[PDB]
Amino acid sequence: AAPILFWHRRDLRLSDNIGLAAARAQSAQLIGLFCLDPQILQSADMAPARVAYLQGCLQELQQRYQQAGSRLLLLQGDPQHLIPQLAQQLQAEAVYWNQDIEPYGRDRDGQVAAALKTAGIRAVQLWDQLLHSPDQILSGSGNPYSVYGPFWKNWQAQPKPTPVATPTELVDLSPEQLTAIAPLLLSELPTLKQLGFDWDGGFPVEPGETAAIARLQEFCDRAIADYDPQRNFPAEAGTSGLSPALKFGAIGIRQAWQAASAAHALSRSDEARNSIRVWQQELAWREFYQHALYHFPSLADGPYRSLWQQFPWENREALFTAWTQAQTGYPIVDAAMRQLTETGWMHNRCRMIVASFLTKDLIIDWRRGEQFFMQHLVDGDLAANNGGWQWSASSGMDPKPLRIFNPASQAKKFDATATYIKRWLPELRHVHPKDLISGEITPIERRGYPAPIVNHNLRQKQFKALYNQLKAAI
DNA sequence: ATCGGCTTCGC
DNA sequence: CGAAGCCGA
Numbered sequence A: 001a002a003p004i005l006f007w008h009r010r011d012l013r014l015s016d017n018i019g020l021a022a023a024r025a026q027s028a029q030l031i032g033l034f035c036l037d038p039q040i041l042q043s044a045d046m047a048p049a050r051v052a053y054l055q056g057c058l059q060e061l062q063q064r065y066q067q068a069g070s071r072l073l074l075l076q077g078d079p080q081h082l083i084p085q086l087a088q089q090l091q092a093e094a095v096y097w098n099q100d101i102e103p104y105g106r107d108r109d110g111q112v113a114a115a116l117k118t119a120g121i122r123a124v125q126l127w128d129q130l131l132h133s134p135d136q137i138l139s140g141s142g143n144p145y146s147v148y149g150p151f152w153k154n155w156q157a158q159p160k161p162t163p164v165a166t167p168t169e170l171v172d173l174s175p176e177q178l179t180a181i182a183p184l185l186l187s188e189l190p191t192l193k194q195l196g197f198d199w200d201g202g203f204p205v206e207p208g209e210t211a212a213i214a215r216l217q218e219f220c221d222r223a224i225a226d227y228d229p230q231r232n233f234p235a236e237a238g239t240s241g242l243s244p245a246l247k248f249g250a251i252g253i254r255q256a257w258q259a260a261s262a263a264h265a266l267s268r269s270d271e272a273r274n275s276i277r278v279w280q281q282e283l284a285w286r287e288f289y290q291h292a293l294y295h296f297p298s299l300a301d302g303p304y305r306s307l308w309q310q311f312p313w314e315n316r317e318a319l320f321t322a323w324t325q326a327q328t329g330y331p332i333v334d335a336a337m338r339q340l341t342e343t344g345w346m347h348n349r350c351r352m353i354v355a356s357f358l359t360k361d362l363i364i365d366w367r368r369g370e371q372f373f374m375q376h377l378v379d380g381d382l383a384a385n386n387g388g389w390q391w392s393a394s395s396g397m398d399p400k401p402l403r404i405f406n407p408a409s410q411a412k413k414f415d416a417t418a419t420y421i422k423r424w425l426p427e428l429r430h431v432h433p434k435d436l437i438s439g440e441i442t443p444i445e446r447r448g449y450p451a452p453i454v455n456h457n458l459r460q461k462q463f464k465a466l467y468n469q470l471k472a473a474i
Numbered sequence B: 001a002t003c004g005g006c007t008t009c010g011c
Numbered sequence C: 001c002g003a004a005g006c007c008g009a
């Protein structure tokens, strides 16, 4: 007799959704809900491309709920107060949602659940964004993994859950019920501008559930077979481009796994099978970092290891500015930074290259780079972004190798014809690939393009010195 | 507990 | 071919 509310946050789809399917099993009067949260939307680390993608996903989710039989309610404000209020005025029997791993989200959920319980309303929180929940993957000693290799061995051996059913034949709220909650609702989904953002840089995959599923299918039917080694070349469209869809849950993780598994089963070569397996390992890397953040929330605050907590970063603002403005004088680095600010996305090889460059060559606190990435990435995700940056600065629980990438080596290896470089640095197409890769461009040929802001070999030595020196004095 | 193994590499 | 010490079975 009472409606059940499903609260969407980062699972913007109707298909293969654990919490949603569970709620549907309890009632056909399943009403979706999304709460535009100022604490998230107005954070210093928000990207316009990310909000644009989100907004697009919400537009489709509203449509999907309408076709299913009910609707997606939209609220704006603090969910701790709005969600319980909505559930009460609606006399909802329960509120379902999928758990997250981020500190803010988990804290928020604790408050909402508590408020609901006090109101006598059931709050059900299920795991959905991961193939295996955090407490499901532990070492022999029953503790979380800090090393990927072992985590993967465990993770890959675990039986894989299959996609759940999409809810259908829903029952909408009555006109009276809508009247009772009207005061708490937004009449319409605000435009991107109304949310305080502007974006026309495009996306790696169009927003929404439909486009995410389409990309998954297309990727698994062709390109996935060549993932290894095509994944290493930024000039090639060798990766899935699904990152924002996985971040916001426009696609279910079980459906993604199923599609990759299917391609593997129908593969006719060891090369193809290897490529597909490598892509599956990337999905495991995603879970590794999410699990890590869940088990060790302090990771979000910075270096876990005492050594890196004391590292004497040079922090020359002029160098950071040059990095953010793609004016480093290092073509491969500048091209990557241009792709990021202009399109809200960066190939993984380049994310490693520019992160290494910022921390090792410019010797700037990686946390500055972490923030800048969150300010531009359409797929900006605390767990994965913090994981990537700490990896680049090698700041884990124990001493790890100094991963000092050589920009020229990287470019020669992964962009041998400077195709990617020329694509994002069109002003340098007249320069020979050889010089774009080495970074040695004659003054008259750079036509305004900056000379290298630092010397790699020299900076490499200066960084190692700082390191060893501290490793000694500590 | 000994010991294989440690995403992404430079030289 | 040493990675930085040490996780994980």
Ligand SMILES: Cc1cc2nc3c(=O)[nH]c(=O)nc-3n(C[C@H](O)[C@H](O)[C@H](O)COP(=O)(O)OP(=O)(O)OC[C@H]3O[C@@H](n4cnc5c(N)ncnc54)[C@H](O)[C@@H]3O)c2cc1C
Pocket: A231, A239, A240, A241, A242, A243, A244, A246, A247, A282, A283, A285, A286, A287, A289, A346, A347, A348, A349, A351, A352, A355, A373, A377, A379, A380, A381, A382, A384, A385, A386, A387, A388, A389, A392
């Ligand atoms: C410094 C740095 C910052 C990063 N920031 C983010 C971020 O904010 N959000 C994010 O999702 N990824 C981040 N990455 C990881 C990786 O670069 C991106 O997931 C990838 O570029 C997404 O593109 P894709 O969809 O084509 O990838 P694919 O190669 O198609 O991989 C499929 C999916 O696997 C996951 N995945 C792949 N590689 C990784 C990885 N290394 N870590 C975690 N998940 C991975 C993603 O969800 C991705 O969509 C970062 C990496 C580094 C080195």
Ligand SMILES: O=c1nc2n(C[C@H](O)[C@H](O)[C@H](O)CO)c3cc(O)ccc3cc-2c(=O)[nH]1
Pocket: A008, A009, A010, A034, A035, A036, A037, A038, A040, A041, A050, A051, A054, A100, A102, A103, A104, A105, A106, A380
């Ligand atoms: O519930 C919400 N979740 C939003 N999310 C999803 C969240 O990450 C989610 O609430 C997490 O659980 C927070 O820890 C966003 C994610 C982004 O990357 C960018 C913007 C948003 C905005 C919201 C929002 O307004 N409301």
Ligand SMILES: [Mg+2]
Pocket: A397, A398
């Ligand atoms: Mg230790």
